[PDB]
Amino acid sequence: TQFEERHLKFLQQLGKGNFGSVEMCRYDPLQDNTGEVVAVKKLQTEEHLRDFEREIEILKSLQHDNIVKYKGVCYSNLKLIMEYLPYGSLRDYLQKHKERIDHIKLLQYTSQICKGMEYLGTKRYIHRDLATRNILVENENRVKIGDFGLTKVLPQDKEYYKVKEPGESPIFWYAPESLTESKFSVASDVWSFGVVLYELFTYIEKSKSPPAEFMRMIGGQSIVTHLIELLKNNGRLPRPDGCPDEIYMIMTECWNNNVNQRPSFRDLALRVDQIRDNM
Amino acid sequence: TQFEERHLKFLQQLGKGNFGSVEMCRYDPLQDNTGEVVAVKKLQHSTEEHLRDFEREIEILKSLQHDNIVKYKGVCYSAGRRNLKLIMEYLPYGSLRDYLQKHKERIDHIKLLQYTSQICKGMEYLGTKRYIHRDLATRNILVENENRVKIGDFGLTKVLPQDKEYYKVKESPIFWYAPESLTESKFSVASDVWSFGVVLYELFTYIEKSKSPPAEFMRMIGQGQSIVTHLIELLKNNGRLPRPDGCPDEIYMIMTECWNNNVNQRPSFRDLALRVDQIRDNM
Ligand SMILES: Cc1cc(Nc2ncc(C)c(N3CC(O)(C4CC4)C3)n2)sn1
Ligand SMILES: Cc1cc(Nc2ncc(C)c(N3CC(O)(C4CC4)C3)n2)sn1
């Protein structure tokens, strides 16, 4: 399905980053306000352009209930057209609607994230950026992974990917081996999933955020250096208040220093599903 | 048991109020560091009027015999029967407020509901004596062990008149008070139930200071009038504390029913016990 620029009508900025923006647009070839609302990602380097071309093809290759839908591309620079999900990021949804979201609902979302991550796994894709800000809410009962800007394809013969990036990284979501050796794997995605579970069960309360807690535990060396040393000494995020024992246990296993001792996404889905039924 | 002052050995201050102090002492008649540790309540700078209230507080506690009520052990007079002290069992884990702040990472919703159940049973028992607590707050509940809490102070507790279901009191914990307590100083079993709703709120927020009843009410209040005036008006307009993060639906519903403006629409402590117990089993 082709998208002409001339019919792409700017409605609102959804987000602006470094090197990228996302906009709500109406695709309106009949110019009567009837056309479909879509999300449009675009660049705001040759290196960022390369990453974006690869990001488009990664998303185009994904078809899953819990992955934001690829719709197409729009050229003049390149724009990536996606389905618009009206409730926005899980991060913002949960801050807004937390008084109406119980533990059962959190475990529903958790399950769906695990299924999307399991599917990424089958393509040998490493997300690298698993955070509630990168998950989207389609409705009360469905979330989707909604950004693939850092996603890498494993080499054919290796279980990890080493990255040379000099930009800001979401370090308070990163596995120790990601921080020390820039090694990214399914196991570093599982570490990051543990931090997502933490975000959900703290209800995105600012005073309990991963950066708040890590900086409190840290107190002339970079924050990265202090964080590696703290994780090496088995410093961890604390149990969220009222977090069920089996959910805290899942988080602590995700945060094993040893990549090879972290759970599989298939196992996580099963264990989350069982906690949810048990409740 | 009579307790002689000469054998009561001060170990540590447990707490200090406007008119009172509580101390950990060893009762050591054998003066070999072997005697039993007890909690001792005394008046700070006694009036005759505070002394009268304290004598009534003593008789209230002496009349209570219940697994979830701190044990009365006896009284201690200074020389010449000048100064009354109330001797209680010492509960080593202290206030629920402090225990939960300390040990929250090891206390799940099941445990909170066990404590909640036990508070309801103590309150049901108070009810049968026609006693109104007036001060139901996690700072006034004590932790004997991981599986047992007790109501642990009766310093504001009143006996109902013979012919009425409320007592009218001629600083107060206003952020735990029922609207009719704030406007008319009317205290009843229903105003105790309102306060219990706030205890449930305290427990399910895990005593987090940014979510405390005073923090939330003051945020809702934002003013050329007393805080009490702003609070009455807020509660009249159905302002309420918000649902604690991850509070089960049926526990938030219990909280909201305890905070009905109409005294006659608030649940009974017998019903609250049943409902809390059932949520706990269902979990
Ligand atoms: C209120 C609201 C609605 C939004 N919808 C929407 N729909 C699709 C996408 C791809 C999208 N994005 C990508 C985004 O940068 C972050 C998830 C990664 C926001 N947002 S956003 N806010
Ligand atoms: C660490 C610790 C242990 C405590 N134990 C204890 N044992 C009995 C009583 C009566 C008591 N009190 C009365 C108190 O003023 C408030 C609850 C009403 C503390 N404390 S206290 N702290």
SS3 assignment, position B156: coil
Q: Compute CA B73 distance to the chain's CA centroid, rounded to the nearest angstrom.
A: 19
Q: How far apart are CA A159 and CA A216, in angstroms?
A: 34
Return all residues near A130 (Cβ < 8 A) that are at least 6 apart.
A113, A117, A145, A173, A189, A192, A193, A195, A196
* CB atoms inside a 10 Å sphere around CB A164: 5
Pick the CATH number of A90-278 from 3.40.50.970, 1.10.510.10, 3.40.50.2300, 1.25.50.20: 1.10.510.10
Say if residues A192 and A130 touch (Cβ distance below 8 Å).
yes
B120: phi > 0 → left, psi -120 to 50 → alpha, else beta; which?
alpha
Q: Give the number of the atom of ligand 2 that is nearest the alpha carbon of residue B20.
A: 15
B174 class by beta-carbon count within 10 Å (0-12 exposed, 13-18 middle, 19+ buried): middle
Pick the CATH number of A5-83 from 3.30.390.10, 3.30.200.20, 3.40.50.10480, 1.10.1040.10: 3.30.200.20
φ and ψ at A152, to 5 degrees?
Answer: -125, 155
∠ CA A62-A43-A117, rounded to 5°: 25
Say if residues B176 and B213 touch (Cβ distance below 8 Å).
yes
List of chain A residues whose C-beta atoms are within 8 Å of the C-beta of residue B283: 279
SS3 assignment, position A212: helix
CB contact (8 A) between residue A241 and residue B245? yes
- Let me know how long chain A is: 279
Following DSSP, what letter does each residue of B176-245 receive, concatenated? G--HHHHHH-EEEHHHHHHHHHHHHHHHHTTT-GGGSHHHHHHHHH---S-HHHHHHHHHHTT--PPPPT
In eight-state DSSP terms, residue A174 is -
Q: How far is the alpha carbon of A241 from chain B, nearest alpha carbon, in Å?
A: 7
Q: How far apart are CA B230 and CA B227, in angstroms?
A: 5
Residues with CB under 6 A from ligand 2: B 14-15, 22, 39, 70, 88, 90-91, 94-95, 140, 142, 152-153
List of chain B residues whose C-beta atoms are within 8 Å of the C-beta of residue A203: 245-246
Could you say which of A102, A242, A245 has the minimum Cβ distance to residue B206? A242
Q: How far apart are CA A165 and CA B20, in angstroms?
A: 64
Tokens representing residue B65 in the block: 């015999």
E-only strand ranges, chain B: 3-4, 8-16, 20-27, 36-43, 72-77, 84-89, 131-132, 141-145, 148-151, 158-159, 166-168, 186-188
Residue whose Cα lies nearest atom 4 of ligand 1: it is A88
The closest ligand to the CA of A136 turns out to be 1
| B189-204 helix and B269-282 helix, angle to the nearest 10 degrees | 20
Tokens representing residue B68 in the block: 């979830």
Pick the CATH number of B96-282 from 1.50.10.10, 1.10.510.10, 3.30.360.10, 3.40.50.1260: 1.10.510.10
List of chain A residues whose C-beta atoms are within 8 Å of the C-beta of residue B209: none
Q: How far is the CA of B280 from the centre of ligand 2 (A)?
A: 27
SS3 assignment, position A202: coil
Return all residues near B125 (Cβ < 8 A) that are at least 6 apart.
B64, B66, B68, B69
Q: How far apart are CA B142 and CA A6, in angstroms?
A: 70
A32-35 contacts, C-beta under 8 A, 24 or more apart: A35/A7, A35/A9
Contact A148 CB / ligand 1 (< 6 Å): no
- For domain B3-89, the CATH architecture is 2-Layer Sandwich (3.30)
Residue pointed to by tokens 């996580």:
A268
Q: Where are the domains of chain B?
A: 3-89, 96-282
- Let me know how long chain B is: 283
* Active site residue ranges of A: 129
